[PDB]
Design a binder for this molecule. Structure first.
Ligand code: HEM
Ligand code: HEM
Ligand SMILES: C[C@H](O)[C@H](O)[C@H]1CNc2nc(N)[nH]c(=O)c2N1
Ligand SMILES: C[C@H](O)[C@H](O)[C@H]1CNc2nc(N)[nH]c(=O)c2N1
Ligand SMILES: Cc1cc(N)nc(CCCN(C)C)c1
Ligand SMILES: Cc1cc(N)nc(CCCN(C)C)c1
Ligand SMILES: [Cl-]
Ligand SMILES: [Cl-]
Ligand SMILES: [Gd]
Ligand SMILES: [Gd]
Ligand SMILES: [Gd]
Ligand SMILES: [Zn+2]
Lengths: 400, 402
C-alpha cells in the first residue's frame, strides 16, 4: 500500500483505495507517463460491482433489496443484452464519477449534484431543450449550481447521441488573410465546422458559438443559443481603470460537453456536467496561454512594465493582475467563482475526508496544483496517487 | 515508444531513449507515484560496467575498436581478481557529466557539458577531505562568477567504510529549536544542527548562522570542520523599490552545493561526490523563503506591502511572492553573483530537450520538478509533456549515515 507524505506538516497516510483500481493507467516500472494529457458478456461484471457499490453506500449489503436488484439486472441482460439503471443508481453513479475524477480540484462538492434524466430523449430538437433547461438551471442568475444531464445510453446497431462542441459555451476562432486567429484559437476547428453547417460567422473576438447536436444516425444540426441564456462577465480591474477598455469578457458557466460517462458497464456518450469556475482557469490558462488569447504582453504594456528583460518578472506581475481582474469582475456581477487558494484548501479537506471514508483518493498532481503560485498552495506539498476507479468520466474520440 | 506532445506549439516527438531505461521507478499500470519525493554478486557489477564502458567508447567515436574490447576484458579480469575495478581519469570526467545529463529533476541541464571535475579519489583522511572541499568552494564561487564543479572522493569498496559528508549541502544555515516551540533559522536543518552540537560545535543564535561540516572518513566518527567566513560568499537581500525590505535582515548564500547524493558510474559507487552550479531564483525566493515549513516570510512581507491579508481573493500571497523573487534577482545582480530566473531557465531547458531529442532520442524529465513553483503555466515547460525514467551514470539518493 503506497505511503503518502505531506511535506508541509510531515504527516503520513497509506492509500488502500488504490487496490481497487479498474482500468490500467499509462505508467510502467520502466517510465512514468503521468504528465501526458491524453494517456461480449463482460457488461455484467461491471454492472454487478456497481450494484454492490450502491447498496453498501446505503448500508444495504446482504439484504433483500440488494439480492433482488442483482437478479433483475441479470435477467435484463439475458433478455435484452443490456440493462437500465434505476433513478437512484444513476444519481449515485453520477456523483461517484465526479468523486473519482482525479484531475478535479473541486470534488469537496461531489455530494451536491443535481441530476437531470434525459434518457427518454429522441431527437436533436429534444437535446436542445434539455441542454437549455440545464444551462438556465445551472446558471441560476449567477448563483451557479452543479448539474449534469444524462442522455440515452449507447446501444449496438444504433448511432450515438453526441454534442460536437467541447463545452456548451465556446468563443469563435477566425482565420485571416495571414492565417492567424481572431477570437479563441482553441476552437478554430469547431468554428469552421459550424460555419460549414450553415452558421454565418460574426466578426468579434468573443462570439458565442452555436451548438452542433447529433441525434443517432442523423447528421448534426445547428442550434442558436438564446443570448439571454448565456450569462457573461465583462472584465474590469478594481484599480487599473484602463483594463475594462481592453474589451475582455468570459462566460459564467463551465460545462464540459465532450466526455463520456460510464456507470456499471453502461456508456453515455452525451452527458454534459457543469459547476463553477476556478479563477486561474480563465485568468491564467484561457487568457494567458500563448496559444489561447495570449494577452500577457498587452496587459504589461498597459501597466508600463519593462518587458525587455525576463528578470523584471513582468510576466508574473501582469498575470497576477489578470487573475485579480477575473475574481473582481465575477464577484461584482455576483457570479459564483473560487480562487486557487480557497479551492486548494478545500481540496486538502477533501483528501482528509476521503482518507477516513474510503482510505484514499485518486489525484493527478499536475492538474490539482494550480498554474500560478503552485508552491504557495498546500496541494503542492501533498504527495498524491493517481489511478482509475469506476464509475468515471472518460475521454472519447471526436464524432467526425 | 511513448508519444510526447508540446501543447503550446503542436510539436510531437517519440521518446526512444526511454527503452534503454535500466533501473525501475515506482509507478505501475495500476497507479502512478510520480509525485512522491523519495520513490525508493560479480556478474551484475560486470554488466553495468560493460554498459558504461560502451557509453564512453561511443562518446569518443571509438566503438568496437581494439581499445574498446581492451578495456572490456581488462575490467572483467580486474573484477575477477579484485572484485571491483578502477575508472580511468577520462572515464570519470565523462561519467560525472553523464550523471548530470541524466538527472530528471535538474532544469539547468543545458550546461551539462560544462563541468569541472576534481579527482580526489586519493583522499586519505577527513582532514584532507576538508582541504579538497574548501578548494571546491573557492573555485566554484569564483568571487560571484560561479562555475559548475564536482569533487569525487574515493569509491565504495569492500573492507573499508565509506567517505561521507553528513551535511546535505556544503552551505546550510542553522536551525535552532526555540523557547516556545518555534525554530530560529532554517527549520529544514534542525537535525544536522543538532548533530553538529552533539559533536561539539558551539551554536550561535542567529537566523543565518552557517553550519560547520561533519566529515566522515572510513571507519571513523565524523569530524567537525568550520568553514572560514571569507570562503562562504553570501548576498544581503534588498528590494529595488521597497526600501523597507532591507530591514528584514535576510540573506542567502551564493553557492548551491549538494553533498549527500551518491554518484554511480558503471556499477561503482561514490557516496561522497559533492556537486555545485548556480541558483535559479525560485529555489530561494519561492521555496526557501516562502514555504510555510521554511523561513515562512510571505505574510510578513504582504503586511509590510500594505496588502489585504484577510481574504484570499485579493491574491496577496501571489503579489508578495512575486516581489520576494524580484528582491532575490535584484540582490544577486547587485552583488554580481550568478543567478537565473525561472523564465530564462525553463526556456533554456526547452533547448536542452531539443538538443537531446536529436542526440539521444529523448530526455528523462520529472515534470513536477521541472515546472517552477510560481508562474508554472507562464513558462514553456508547463506545456511540454515529459517522460521520467532512470539512466546510468546517475546521482541517487542514499540514507543518512546516522
Ligand atoms: C463545483 C465547482 C467545480 C470546480 C471549482 C472545478 C474545478 C476544476 C478544475 C480547475 C479542473 C481542471 C480542468 C482544466 O484545467 O481544464 C477540473 C477538472 C474536471 N472536473 Fe471539476 N470543478 C467543479 C465541478 C465539477 C463537476 C460538477 C464535475 C462533474 C459532475 C466535475 C468533473 C471534472 C472533470 C471530469 C474534470 C476533468 C476535465 C478534463 O480532464 O478535461 N467538476 N475541475
Ligand atoms: C549550473 C546551473 C544549475 C542550475 C540552474 C540548476 C537547477 C536546478 C534546480 C532548480 C533543481 C531543483 C532543486 C530543488 O528543487 O531542490 C535542480 C536539481 C538537481 N540538479 Fe541541477 N542546476 C544546476 C547545476 C547542476 C549541476 C552542476 C549538477 C551536477 C553535476 C546538478 C544536478 C542536479 C541534481 C542531481 C538535482 C536533483 C536534486 C534533488 O533531487 O534533490 N545540477 N537543479
Ligand atoms: C504537459 C502537461 O501535462 C499539460 O500542459 C497539463 C499540465 N497540467 C494541467 N493541469 C490542468 N488543470 N489543466 C491542464 O490543461 C494541464 N495541462
Ligand atoms: C509533494 C511534491 O512532490 C513535492 O512538494 C515536490 C513537488 N515538486 C518539486 N519540485 C522541485 N523542483 N523541488 C521540490 O522540492 C519539489 N517538491
Ligand atoms: C465541471 C467543471 C468545472 C470547472 N471549473 N472546470 C471544468 C473544465 C473546464 C474545461 N477545461 C477542459 C478547459 C469543468
Ligand atoms: C547543484 C544545484 C544547483 C541548483 N541550482 N540547485 C540545487 C539544489 C539545492 C538543494 N535542493 C535539493 C534543496 C543544486
Ligand atoms: Cl474553460
Ligand atoms: Cl537550497
Ligand atoms: Gd499612459
Ligand atoms: Gd519605495
Ligand atoms: Gd518585524
Ligand atoms: Zn507515473
Amino acid at each position: 500500500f503506497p505511503r503518502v507524505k505531506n511535506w508541509e506538516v510531515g504527516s503520513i497516510t497509506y492509500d488502500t483505495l488504490s487496490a481497487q483500481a479498474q482500468q490500467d493507467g499509462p505508467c510502467t516500472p520502466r517510465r512514468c507517463l503521468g504528465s501526458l494529457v491524453f494517456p461480449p458478456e463482460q457488461l455484467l461484471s461491471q454492472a454487478r460491482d456497481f450494484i454492490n457499490q450502491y447498496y453498501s453506500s446505503i448500508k444495504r449489503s446482504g439484504s433483500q433489496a440488494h439480492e433482488q436488484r442483482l437478479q433483475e439486472v441479470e435477467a435484463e441482460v439475458a433478455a435484452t443484452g443490456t440493462y437500465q439503471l434505476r433513478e437512484s443508481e444513476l444519481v449515485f453513479g453520477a456523483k461517484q464519477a465526479w468523486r473519482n475524477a482525479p484531475r478535479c480540484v473541486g470534488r469537496i462538492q461531489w455530494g451536491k449534484l443535481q441530476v437531470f434524466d434525459a434518457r427518454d430523449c429522441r431527437s436533436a430538437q429534444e437535446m436542445f431543450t434539455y441542454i437549455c433547461n440545464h444551462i438556465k438551471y445551472a446558471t441560476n442568475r449567477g448563483n451557479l449550481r452543479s448539474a449534469i444531464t444524462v442522455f440515452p445510453q449507447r446501444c449496438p446497431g444504433r448511432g450515438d447521441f453526441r454534442i460536437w462542441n467541447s463545452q456548451l459555451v465556446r468563443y469563435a476562432g477566425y482565420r485571416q488573410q495571414d492565417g492567424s486567429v481572431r477570437g479563441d484559437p482553441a476552437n478554430v476547428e469547431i468554428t469552421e465546422l459550424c460555419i460549414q453547417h450553415g452558421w454565418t460567422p460574426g466578426n468579434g473576438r468573443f462570439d458565442v458559438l452555436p451548438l452542433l447536436l447529433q441525434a443517432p444516425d442523423e447528421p448534426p444540426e445547428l442550434f442558436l443559443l438564446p443570448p439571454e441564456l448565456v450569462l457573461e462577465v465583462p472584465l474590469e480591474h478594481p484599480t487599473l481603470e484602463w483594463f475594462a477598455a481592453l474589451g475582455l469578457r468570459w462566460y459564467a458557466l463551465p460545462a464540459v460537453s465532450n466526455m463520456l460517462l460510464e456507470i456499471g458497464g453502461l456508456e453515455f456518450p452525451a452527458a454534459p456536467f457543469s459547476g463553477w469556475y476556478m479563477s486561474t482557469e480563465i485568468g491564467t490558462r484561457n487568457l494567458c496561454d500563448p496559444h489561447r488569447y495570449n494577452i500577457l504582453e498587452d496587459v504589461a504594456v498597459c501597466m508600463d512594465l519593462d518587458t525587455r528583460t525576463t528578470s523584471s518578472l513582468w510576466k508574473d506581475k501582469a498575470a497576477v493582475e489578470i487573475n485579480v481582474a477575473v475574481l473582481h469582475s465575477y464577484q461584482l456581477a455576483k457570479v459564483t467563482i473560487v480562487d486557487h487558494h480557497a479551492a486548494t484548501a478545500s481540496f486538502m479537506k477533501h483528501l482528509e475526508n476521503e482518507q477516513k471514508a474510503r482510505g484514499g483518493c485518486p489525484a493527478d498532481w499536475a492538474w490539482i496544483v494550480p498554474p500560478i503560485s503552485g508552491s504557495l498552495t498546500p496541494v503542492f506539498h501533498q504527495e498524491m496517487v493517481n489511478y482509475f476507479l469506476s464509475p468515471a468520466f472518460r475521454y472519447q474520440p471526436d464524432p467526425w
